[PDB]
Design a binder for this molecule. Structure first.
Ligand code: ZN
Lengths: 71, 183, 74, 185, 117, 86, 121
RNA sequence: UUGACCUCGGAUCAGGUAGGAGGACCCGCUGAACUUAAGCAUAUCAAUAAGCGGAGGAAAAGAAACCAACAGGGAUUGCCCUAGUAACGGCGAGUGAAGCGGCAACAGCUCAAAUUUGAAAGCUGGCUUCGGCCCGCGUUGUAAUUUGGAGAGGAUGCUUU
């Protein structure tokens, strides 16, 4: 708190952190999945459009109609 | 080869050979310093099964600890006190392990295998360089050696219900009032 | 006087006979600090001074703790 | 009067303690060591069968490498190393075993005379682990063993074996069982 | 039951939807890393221990070595192609063996394995 | 001999006096080592490596051959050539 | 009085030393005579101080560059010529040391790597 | 006389490392009293506060000397219910878990006990023309192989870099 009060009255700049995440949220590359991945679609909808299974476990909630990814 | 025989001999500590050798060594250690560097392990089978290697970066340190109570008993083990005293003398080393070597009427003697984390022979070996990570700074002070693991009750089962994941973390988990959003 | 100037904290709290500071404990390596006084801990906390070096660390972290010069520098 | 240093006094008092206590027979057997002549004969044979140093090994390997650039029998050497020699004794491969008498953790070698007696390998206790060390190009050697030799001196090895089993084993046979030391008198 | 200082140990959960968003983004990151692969591993069907739950079944930890050998899947290849292996479990009966073997051949029937290079 | 050494001996001896037995220092009876073991203790097979030339030395020699072919190391010269050269 | 930086970058050591000497002498004389009737002398004094700072910076940079050219293949560098980082960053395991594996692990990873696959719906 | 070994020391010798801070969360050690029981001492407060030691971005725990009595489960951690149940208690005040079940996340491994013995095959330093040369550590054991729901050695024929 005293440190934050000090920086408020200090002429030293506020060091803004960029939002660099450790893990990327979208697949990338020149492979098949990367050129057909919709960044505005979820994992289940993307794997539905691919024709693949996303989760091999037991269903844990209700799904949207035409899920086809949560086996 | 010979280490099997030494293990069987170490299992008979009141036999004539082992009793004679223990008494002569106790006399010498009593007249040495409290915490003194040991050139080689007096029990090579025991040190070898605890992870000691005849390699640059490995050090033995013999230490005597006054035995008896602290009728308030010290909940800290005498072996834990030994590792802590040696760890302060060798503040640049990491305590790997320790083992009983001798006992007298007023002292109990232990040997502590230490490892240098800055030696290149240790930093290049994938079997020991886990100790080079800074999360292993002073393992003897946080109950992370063998005596620390025993005294904290870190065992599986119904007998170790309140201590198997940490006693104070379990107590904080049981004494926390969880209020959700939809009540 | 009872208390003289201390070298570490700069206060007139160093006992003239015991030669021990009542505010920081100057001959001891560790600075005197107690958890029953939060006000005392916040009067000498990290951030109440000049920060000659600790204020330069976040900018060096932001660029990855890099060395060298930009390309084309003179 | 004058004051002696501490470690020298510890050394001399460890002498007197190890020689004037009632020593158990397994430790008291190590005070009976080979004579000068038999140790000289044994070391003549073991000096005939020394291993190669690092320089000779790299030199020989360079010779084979350039011979390949431009046939052998099994090498016969003195066998050393405590666990290796114990494994050789247990499998009845060793022919003669020489055990040093000044191994500081003496537990590493107390069972060795009894083991050699049980499996039937002739053994002898020699003066100096540093002597066995010079033979194998190391600083020290707790025990050395010879298993088999080249043809041209097999007879000599046999005589040496017989020598120790007539010159050391029967002189030790009665005193290998008795406690040593004491201040009676 | 407020005998102790419960004020210092009240845990609220105003970060429940934020943690749900964090969990979904972690699953998305797992999807990004394992792009054609499922984010989950295949797990066997096991029976619930006690007599109260003996009637129902659930997902286990990993397939038995006998189940993998009977399905025709080698032990060392199995963790690298999305199957979980448990060396502690035993079959003990011919009915769990057949069920999990059927599960493994059903998984094999619907798998697109790519060559190494 | 001297009194101090004998005092030390008596101290460490009193540390090793079992007075509850009639004979604290009996003669050793070889109840186990008197019988001889005629066969080895291990019935394990001998590895083929103990009958064939060394494979580690073969790898080392091939590494040396690769080093000579790259000119990285100098080849073999017999010691009399090194003596007459120097 | 005022000197640009690139002109200082072009010159060599003895030259930069003689501008350093003449600037210091001019600053000393102007500080002596500036105690009376300080008019435009103040701006010149400030500019001269900045000029000495620039010259000292250029000589220090050239000297450290030459010292780094000396220690290009030597194993140990002076502590002034080593990267600072942090104390913990200087003590952590190196990239070559941390990425090392055992031979058994390398064999297992060589012959049984993680495979690419897809379960079809 | 000379040279090894072992042990104990010195050096403003070379290369390193520790101390302090911070301490919300974490791992240990140590450890009260008020208060409640309309008095109070067992109990409670509380294995809390204060005090001391030690880390990190998380820590700790962790791949069963486990749970179970099953048609069985299968490292650790955390959420939900279990459950104010079992159990213990001036059986008063009260104290108070765990297995199963649903979920989140999932990942497995390294040594010691073996003889490489047809070849210490291993490693720290110094010198470098940077390619390979010396001293040392080490046989009282450094590499490879193996870690008990395993494994080794031979034989065998496919399949892998
Ligand atoms: Zn002060």
């Amino acid at each position: 708190r005293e440190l934050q009060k000090r920086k408020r009255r200090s002429s030293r700049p506020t060091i803004r952190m960029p939002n660099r995440r450790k893990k990327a949220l979208n697949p990338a590359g020149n492979n098949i999945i990367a050129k057909s991945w919709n960044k505005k679609e979820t994992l289940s909808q993307n794997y539905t459009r691919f024709g693949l299974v996303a989760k091999l476990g037991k269903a844990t909630g209700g799904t949207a109609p035409g899920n086809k990814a949560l086996l | 080869g010979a280490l099997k025989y030494l293990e069987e001999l170490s299992k008979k500590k009141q036999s004539d050979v082992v009793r004679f050798l223990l008494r002569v060594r106790c006399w010498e250690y009593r007249q040495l310093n409290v915490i003194h560097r040991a050139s080689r392990p007096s029990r090579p089978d025991k040190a070898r099964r605890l992870g000691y290697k005849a390699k640059q970066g490995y050090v033995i340190y013999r230490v005597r600890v006054r035995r008896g109570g602290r009728q308030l008993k010290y909940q800290r083990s005498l072996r834990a006190t030994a590792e802590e005293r040696v760890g302060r003398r060798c503040s640049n080393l990491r305590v790997l392990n320790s083992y009983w070597v001798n006992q007298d009427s007023t002292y109990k003697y232990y040997e502590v295998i230490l490892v240098d984390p800055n030696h290149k022979a240790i930093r290049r070996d994938p079997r020991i360089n886990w100790i080079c990570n800074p999360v292993h700074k002073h393992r003897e002070c946080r109950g992370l050696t063998s005596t620390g693991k025993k005294s904290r009750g870190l065992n599986k089962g119904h007998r170790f219900n309140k201590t198997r994941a940490g006693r104070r973390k379990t107590w904080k988990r049981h004494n926390t009032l969880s209020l959700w959003r939809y009540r | 006087k009872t208390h003289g100037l201390c070298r570490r904290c700069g206060r007139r709290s160093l006992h003239n006979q015991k030669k021990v500071c009542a505010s920081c404990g100057y001959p001891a390596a560790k600075t005197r600090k107690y958890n029953w006084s939060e006000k005392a801990k916040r009067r000498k906390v990290t951030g109440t001074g000049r920060m000659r070096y600790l204020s330069t660390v976040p900018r060096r972290f932001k660029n990855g703790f890099r060395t060298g010069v930009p390309k084309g520098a003179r | 009067m004058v004051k002696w240093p501490e470690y020298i006094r510890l050394q001399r008092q460890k002498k007197i303690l190890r020689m004037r206590l009632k020593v158990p027979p397994a430790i008291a057997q190590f005070q009976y060591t080979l004579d000068k002549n038999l140790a000289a004969q044994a070391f003549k044979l073991l000096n005939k069968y020394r291993p190669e140093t690092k320089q000779e090994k790299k030199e020989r390997l360079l010779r084979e490498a350039t011979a390949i650039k431009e046939v052998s029998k099994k090498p016969y050497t003195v066998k050393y190393g405590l666990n290796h020699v114990v494994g050789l004794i247990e499998n009845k491969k060793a022919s003669l075993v020489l055990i040093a008498n000044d191994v500081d953790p003496i537990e590493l070698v107390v069972f060795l005379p009894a083991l050699c007696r049980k499996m039937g390998i002739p053994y002898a206790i020699i003066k100096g682990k540093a002597r066995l060390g010079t033979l194998v190009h190391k600083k020290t050697a707790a025990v050395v063993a010879i298993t088999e030799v080249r043809s041209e001196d097999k007879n000599e090895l046999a005589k040496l074996i017989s020598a120790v089993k007539e010159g050391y084993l029967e002189k030790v046979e009665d005193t290998r069982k008795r406690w040593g030391g004491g201040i009676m008198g | 039951h407020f005998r102790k200082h419960w004020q210092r140990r009240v845990r609220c959960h105003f970060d429940q939807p934020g943690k749900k968003v964090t969990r979904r983004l972690a699953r998305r990151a797992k999807a990004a890393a394992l792009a054609p692969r499922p984010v989950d591993k295949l797990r066997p069907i096991v029976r619930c221990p006690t007599v109260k739950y003996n009637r129902r079944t659930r997902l286990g930890r990993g397939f038995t070595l006998e189940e993998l050998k009977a399905a025709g899947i080698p032990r060392l290849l199995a963790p690298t192609i999305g199957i979980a292996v448990d060396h502690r479990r035993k079959n003990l009966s011919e009915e769990s063996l057949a069920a999990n073997v059927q599960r493994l051949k059903d998984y094999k029937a619907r798998l697109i394995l790519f060559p190494r290079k | 001999l001297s009194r101090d050494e004998l005092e030390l001996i008596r101290k460490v001896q009193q540390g090793l006096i079992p007075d509850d037995v009639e004979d604290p220092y009996p003669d050793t009876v070889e109840w186990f080592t008197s019988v001889e073991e005629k066969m080895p203790l291990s019935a394990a097979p001998e590895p083929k490596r103990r009958f064939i030339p060394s494979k580690n030395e073969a790898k080392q020699i091939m590494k040396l051959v690769r080093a000579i072919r790259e000119g990285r190391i100098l080849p073999y010269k017999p010691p009399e050539e090194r003596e007459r050269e120097e | 009085g005022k000197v640009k930086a690139g002109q200082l970058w072009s010159k060599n050591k003895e030259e930069l030393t003689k501008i350093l000497g003449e600037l210091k002498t001019e600053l000393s004389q102007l500080r002596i005579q500036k105690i009376s009737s300080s008019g435009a002398k103040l701006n010149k004094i400030h500019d001269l101080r900045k000029s000495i700072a620039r010259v000292l910076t250029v000589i220090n940079a050239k000297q450290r560059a030459q010292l780094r050219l000396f220690y290009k293949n030597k194993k140990y560098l002076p502590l002034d010529l080593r990267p600072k980082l942090t104390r913990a960053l200087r003590r952590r395991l190196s990239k070559e040391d941390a990425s090392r594996v055992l031979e058994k692990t390398k064999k297992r990873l060589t012959h049984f790597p993680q495979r690419k696959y897809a379960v079809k719906a």
